[PDB]
Amino acid sequence: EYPTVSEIPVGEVRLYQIADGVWSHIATQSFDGAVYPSNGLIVRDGDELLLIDTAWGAKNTAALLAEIEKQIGLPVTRAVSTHFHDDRVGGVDVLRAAGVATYASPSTRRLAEVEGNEIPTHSLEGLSSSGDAVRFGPVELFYPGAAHSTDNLVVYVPSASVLYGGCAIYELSRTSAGNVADADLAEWPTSIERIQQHYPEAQFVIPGHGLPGGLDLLKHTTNVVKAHTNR
Ligand SMILES: C[C@H](CS)C(=O)NCB(O)O
Ligand SMILES: [Zn+2]
Ligand SMILES: [Zn+2]
């Protein structure tokens, strides 16, 4: 079974096999008086691993690297952060100290700096306008437009038809808006339309927080976002 928030002590990281060469990583962290679960992705990149997002903090990200070494045993050589919040970039300094080349869009890097968060080293090219996509090793990176944040990226693994939505996609059990401080609520439904348009064959859809599902999570997120807007 997919691990839930109450099953993971803060500081421990679980790995979950989604498909051949594709894992999610699951961690937990305290934020504003509560503890939340958080997902990222790991994709085999030949003899190396590509990491999508940190495990939300330095200590968690160190635990992530240790679990990867124990369970998978290939080196993480590159990481992509899919937006500027600490559940995506917190731990980039640990990754860099471990030899990982860290990447994000120029916008994510600037937004992280203003927020006082850690800053991925390298700028991704070609992701500036809504609908832009670039190949990055075994994945495609897609900028769907503003949603959960203005800079949020999604990631597709063609080999396995896995769509990693990050925090622009909600799990099915979430029925109220999450952290929308940095969101563009008016654009978010259209950005989800762009994801659906680009990845209609997705078989597994991974939200930034909580349980994976299928493309039903896209319509579900749109419903939650719109209802919050009508409040
Ligand atoms: C820090 C992280 C950025 S997306 C967050 O807001 N977690 C709480 B959530 O509602 O899951
Ligand atoms: Zn966020
Ligand atoms: Zn998040």
First-to-last alpha carbon distance for the chain, in angstroms, is 35
Q: By three-state DSSP, how is residue 226 classified?
A: helix
| Residue keyed to tokens 């330095």 | 58
Distance, C-alpha 115 to centroid of its chain: 18
Residues in the chain after which the backbone breaks (C–N beyond 2.5 Å): none
Which whole-number Å values give the CA distances from 124 to 40, 66, 142, 146, in the listed order? Answer: 18, 27, 11, 17
The method of structure determination was: X-ray
**Rounded-to-integer distance, Cα 179 and Cα 183, Å:** 8
Atom 3 of ligand 1, residue of closest alpha carbon: 85
In 3D space, the residue among 45, 43, 41 whose CA is nearest the CA of residue 27 turns out to be 41
In 3D space, the residue among 207, 131, 132 whose CA is nearest the CA of residue 163 turns out to be 207
- What is the number of the ligand closest to the CA of 152? 2
Number of Cβ within 10 Å of residue 106's Cβ equals: 13
In 3D space, the residue among 141, 217, 213, 221 whose CA is nearest the CA of residue 187 turns out to be 221
Number of Cβ within 10 Å of residue 231's Cβ equals: 6
Which whole-number Å values give the CA distances from 127 to 57, 134, 161, 197, in the listed order? Answer: 26, 7, 21, 17
**Rounded-to-integer distance, Cα 134 and Cα 24, Å:** 21
Q: Is 115 annotated as a binding residue?
A: no
Ligand 1 contact, 179 CB (< 6 A): yes
Which whole-number Å values give the CA distances from 228 to 58, 115, 177, 179, 224, in the listed order? Answer: 33, 25, 6, 12, 6
**Under a CB-based contact definition with an 8 Å cutoff, are residues 68 and 77 in contact?**
no
| CA geometry: angle 113, 163, 192, nearest 5 deg | 75
Residues of the domain holding 152? 1-231
Helices 188-198/216-230 angle, 10° precision: 170
The secondary element (H helix, E strand) that includes residue 110 is helix 106-115
Q: What are phi and psi of 118, to 5 degrees?
A: -65, 150
Q: By three-state DSSP, how is residue 116 classified?
A: coil
At 162, list the tokens.
């896995």
How many Å lie between the centroid of ligand 3 and the Cα of residue 178?
Answer: 9
Rg of the chain (C-alpha set)? 16
Tally of domains in the chain: 1
How many Å lie between the centroid of ligand 3 and the Cα of residue 213?
Answer: 17
Strand bridging mode 162-166 / 154-157: antiparallel
The answer to whether residue 148 is catalytic is yes
**Rounded-to-integer distance, Cα 2 and Cα 13, Å:** 13
Ligand 1 contact, 209 CB (< 6 A): yes
Strand bridging mode 76-80 / 48-52: parallel
Strand bridging mode 133-136 / 22-31: unpaired
Does residue 77 come out as left (phi exceeding 0), alpha (psi in the -120 to 50 range) or beta?
alpha
Number of Cβ within 10 Å of residue 8's Cβ equals: 19
**Given 86, 87, 117, 152, the catalytic residue:** 87
How many Å lie between the centroid of ligand 2 and the Cα of residue 167?
Answer: 6
